[PDB]
PDB file of C-alpha atoms in Angstrom:
ATOM      1  CA  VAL L1464       8.813  -7.489   3.395  1.00  0.00           C
ATOM      2  CA  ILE L1465       5.279  -8.977   3.658  1.00  0.00           C
ATOM      3  CA  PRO L1466       2.839  -6.429   5.170  1.00  0.00           C
ATOM      4  CA  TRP L1467       0.386  -8.775   6.837  1.00  0.00           C
ATOM      5  CA  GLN L1468      -0.630  -6.543   9.754  1.00  0.00           C
ATOM      6  CA  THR L1469      -1.816  -3.696   7.515  1.00  0.00           C
ATOM      7  CA  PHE L1470      -3.722  -6.293   5.476  1.00  0.00           C
ATOM      8  CA  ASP L1471      -5.464  -7.575   8.621  1.00  0.00           C
ATOM      9  CA  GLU L1472      -6.291  -4.041   9.794  1.00  0.00           C
ATOM     10  CA  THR L1473      -7.836  -3.303   6.391  1.00  0.00           C
ATOM     11  CA  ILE L1474      -9.926  -6.496   6.384  1.00  0.00           C
ATOM     12  CA  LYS L1475     -11.202  -5.871   9.919  1.00  0.00           C
ATOM     13  CA  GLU L1476     -12.036  -2.233   9.195  1.00  0.00           C
ATOM     14  CA  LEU L1477     -14.004  -3.200   6.085  1.00  0.00           C
ATOM     15  CA  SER L1478     -15.723  -5.955   8.082  1.00  0.00           C
ATOM     16  CA  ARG L1479     -16.743  -3.735  11.015  1.00  0.00           C
ATOM     17  CA  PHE L1480     -18.640  -1.301   8.739  1.00  0.00           C
ATOM     18  CA  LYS L1481     -20.915  -4.096   7.545  1.00  0.00           C
ATOM     19  CA  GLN L1482     -21.598  -5.410  11.067  1.00  0.00           C
ATOM     20  CA  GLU L1483     -22.513  -1.901  12.235  1.00  0.00           C
ATOM     21  CA  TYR L1484     -24.978  -1.232   9.451  1.00  0.00           C
ATOM     22  CA  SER L1485     -26.554  -4.704   9.648  1.00  0.00           C
ATOM     23  CA  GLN L1486     -27.152  -4.221  13.378  1.00  0.00           C
ATOM     24  CA  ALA L1487     -28.575  -0.755  12.694  1.00  0.00           C
ATOM     25  CA  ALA L1488     -30.882  -1.735   9.826  1.00  0.00           C
ATOM     26  CA  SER L1489     -32.293  -4.959  11.315  1.00  0.00           C
ATOM     27  CA  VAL L1490     -33.717  -3.297  14.441  1.00  0.00           C
ATOM     28  CA  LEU L1491     -35.403  -0.581  12.389  1.00  0.00           C
ATOM     29  CA  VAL L1492     -36.954  -3.005   9.887  1.00  0.00           C
ATOM     30  CA  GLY L1493     -38.252  -5.141  12.777  1.00  0.00           C
ATOM     31  CA  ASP L1494     -39.802  -2.031  14.332  1.00  0.00           C
ATOM     32  CA  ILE L1495     -41.538  -1.249  11.031  1.00  0.00           C
ATOM     33  CA  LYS L1496     -42.826  -4.862  10.942  1.00  0.00           C
ATOM     34  CA  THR L1497     -44.361  -4.390  14.408  1.00  0.00           C
ATOM     35  CA  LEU L1498     -45.938  -1.068  13.363  1.00  0.00           C
ATOM     36  CA  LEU L1499     -47.503  -2.542  10.213  1.00  0.00           C
ATOM     37  CA  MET L1500     -49.044  -5.421  12.170  1.00  0.00           C
ATOM     38  CA  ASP L1501     -50.430  -3.002  14.788  1.00  0.00           C
ATOM     39  CA  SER L1502     -51.959  -0.878  12.025  1.00  0.00           C
ATOM     40  CA  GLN L1503     -53.628  -3.930  10.489  1.00  0.00           C
ATOM     41  CA  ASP L1504     -55.168  -4.833  13.875  1.00  0.00           C
ATOM     42  CA  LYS L1505     -56.542  -1.289  14.294  1.00  0.00           C
ATOM     43  CA  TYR L1506     -57.937  -1.353  10.744  1.00  0.00           C
ATOM     44  CA  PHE L1507     -59.696  -4.688  11.367  1.00  0.00           C
ATOM     45  CA  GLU L1508     -61.260  -3.463  14.606  1.00  0.00           C
ATOM     46  CA  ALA L1509     -62.565  -0.191  13.124  1.00  0.00           C
ATOM     47  CA  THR L1510     -64.095  -1.741  10.007  1.00  0.00           C
ATOM     48  CA  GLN L1511     -65.616  -4.609  12.021  1.00  0.00           C
ATOM     49  CA  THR L1512     -67.267  -2.126  14.406  1.00  0.00           C
ATOM     50  CA  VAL L1513     -68.795  -0.196  11.497  1.00  0.00           C
ATOM     51  CA  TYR L1514     -69.895  -3.469   9.808  1.00  0.00           C
ATOM     52  CA  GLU L1515     -71.707  -4.608  12.959  1.00  0.00           C
ATOM     53  CA  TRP L1516     -73.457  -1.243  13.307  1.00  0.00           C
ATOM     54  CA  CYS L1517     -74.593  -1.233   9.661  1.00  0.00           C
TER      55      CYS L1517
ATOM     56  CA  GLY P 465     -77.458 -21.977  26.534  1.00  0.00           C
ATOM     57  CA  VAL P 466     -79.661 -19.602  28.537  1.00  0.00           C
ATOM     58  CA  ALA P 467     -80.880 -17.488  25.620  1.00  0.00           C
ATOM     59  CA  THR P 468     -81.945 -20.441  23.459  1.00  0.00           C
ATOM     60  CA  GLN P 469     -84.322 -21.596  26.233  1.00  0.00           C
ATOM     61  CA  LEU P 470     -85.763 -18.246  27.282  1.00  0.00           C
ATOM     62  CA  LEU P 471     -86.572 -17.422  23.658  1.00  0.00           C
ATOM     63  CA  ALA P 472     -88.174 -20.845  23.183  1.00  0.00           C
ATOM     64  CA  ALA P 473     -90.271 -20.151  26.287  1.00  0.00           C
ATOM     65  CA  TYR P 474     -91.285 -16.831  24.702  1.00  0.00           C
ATOM     66  CA  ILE P 475     -92.383 -18.574  21.491  1.00  0.00           C
ATOM     67  CA  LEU P 476     -94.227 -21.248  23.512  1.00  0.00           C
ATOM     68  CA  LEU P 477     -96.125 -19.032  25.959  1.00  0.00           C
ATOM     69  CA  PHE P 478     -97.219 -16.342  23.493  1.00  0.00           C
ATOM     70  CA  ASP P 479     -98.750 -18.303  20.637  1.00  0.00           C
ATOM     71  CA  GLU P 480    -101.844 -16.371  21.683  1.00  0.00           C
ATOM     72  CA  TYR P 481    -101.643 -13.186  23.722  1.00  0.00           C
ATOM     73  CA  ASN P 482    -101.290 -13.713  27.483  1.00  0.00           C
ATOM     74  CA  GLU P 483    -102.063 -10.444  29.262  1.00  0.00           C
ATOM     75  CA  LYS P 484    -101.127 -11.748  32.716  1.00  0.00           C
ATOM     76  CA  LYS P 485     -97.512 -12.610  31.845  1.00  0.00           C
ATOM     77  CA  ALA P 486     -97.030  -9.746  29.381  1.00  0.00           C
ATOM     78  CA  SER P 487     -95.360  -7.302  31.766  1.00  0.00           C
ATOM     79  CA  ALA P 488     -92.789  -9.834  33.000  1.00  0.00           C
ATOM     80  CA  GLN P 489     -91.936 -11.321  29.594  1.00  0.00           C
ATOM     81  CA  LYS P 490     -90.703  -7.925  28.394  1.00  0.00           C
ATOM     82  CA  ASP P 491     -88.484  -7.589  31.479  1.00  0.00           C
ATOM     83  CA  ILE P 492     -87.037 -11.083  30.944  1.00  0.00           C
ATOM     84  CA  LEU P 493     -86.323 -10.254  27.280  1.00  0.00           C
ATOM     85  CA  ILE P 494     -84.657  -6.911  28.103  1.00  0.00           C
ATOM     86  CA  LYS P 495     -82.574  -8.488  30.886  1.00  0.00           C
ATOM     87  CA  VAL P 496     -81.271 -11.472  28.896  1.00  0.00           C
ATOM     88  CA  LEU P 497     -80.524  -9.465  25.737  1.00  0.00           C
ATOM     89  CA  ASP P 498     -78.747  -6.655  27.601  1.00  0.00           C
ATOM     90  CA  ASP P 499     -76.715  -9.334  29.388  1.00  0.00           C
ATOM     91  CA  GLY P 500     -75.793 -10.908  26.066  1.00  0.00           C
ATOM     92  CA  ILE P 501     -74.693  -7.691  24.351  1.00  0.00           C
ATOM     93  CA  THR P 502     -72.262  -6.918  27.194  1.00  0.00           C
ATOM     94  CA  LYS P 503     -70.842 -10.461  27.262  1.00  0.00           C
ATOM     95  CA  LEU P 504     -70.351 -10.618  23.476  1.00  0.00           C
ATOM     96  CA  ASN P 505     -68.681  -7.194  23.387  1.00  0.00           C
ATOM     97  CA  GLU P 506     -66.231  -8.083  26.161  1.00  0.00           C
ATOM     98  CA  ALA P 507     -65.399 -11.393  24.455  1.00  0.00           C
ATOM     99  CA  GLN P 508     -64.557  -9.507  21.249  1.00  0.00           C
ATOM    100  CA  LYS P 509     -62.368  -6.998  23.096  1.00  0.00           C
ATOM    101  CA  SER P 510     -60.520  -9.824  24.869  1.00  0.00           C
ATOM    102  CA  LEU P 511     -59.812 -11.655  21.600  1.00  0.00           C
ATOM    103  CA  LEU P 512     -58.615  -8.408  19.986  1.00  0.00           C
ATOM    104  CA  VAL P 513     -56.165  -7.664  22.815  1.00  0.00           C
ATOM    105  CA  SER P 514     -54.927 -11.259  22.555  1.00  0.00           C
ATOM    106  CA  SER P 515     -54.363 -10.852  18.804  1.00  0.00           C
ATOM    107  CA  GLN P 516     -52.416  -7.613  19.314  1.00  0.00           C
ATOM    108  CA  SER P 517     -49.864  -9.337  21.600  1.00  0.00           C
ATOM    109  CA  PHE P 518     -47.867 -11.119  18.874  1.00  0.00           C
TER     110      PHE P 518
END
């Protein structure tokens, strides 16, 4: 008369979706953070080399 | 520490032209400045690789 098991299955299935996409998006945004910092190091080194030659 | 004394010796000994020490002074200058360019360039490359590790 009180469907508690279907309620728990629904809550856990809505809660697994969010865990999956958080774990997927966080790794990719951290990778983009690493790439942007690497690009800023390469930019600094190139413009400093040309500055010292000039 | 080495360059600031060899260049002061160059300013001291050649207030007037000294033809006897003129062939060796040029070799000392070339040697110490070519040593310094290599050391300064490797120090910059080491600091850059250290900055790219974070």
